């Protein structure tokens, strides 16, 4: 029905914090996913432009 493309840059050790069943600083104060999130999480290293 709806496809939302959220884009953001985070730290490598903070990539796992973005998850429906996890808790962390980035998950609580930067980007929080619901407990019933339906979708995919795509992340890749980009240390060439930044």
């Amino acid at each position: 029905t709806n496809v939302y493309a959220d884009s953001f840059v985070i730290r490598g050790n903070e990539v796992s914090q973005i998850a429906p069943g996890q808790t962390g600083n980035i998950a609580d104060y930067n980007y929080k996913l619901p407990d019933d999130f339906t979708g995919c999480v795509i992340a890749w290293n980009s240390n060439k432009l930044d």
Partner: protein, 50 residues
Amino acid sequence: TPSALGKLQDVVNHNAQALNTLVKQLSSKFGAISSVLNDILSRLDPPEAE
């Protein structure tokens, strides 16, 4: 002979024990961490509290 009114004594005792068992089943855990919902909601993470 107190057993003369046994047909009604058994009925009232069955009702009383059914109520007391239904209210006692709230203290069971059924494989959970604690019988109190407020203790689970204040000691575990949402993905496990659910």
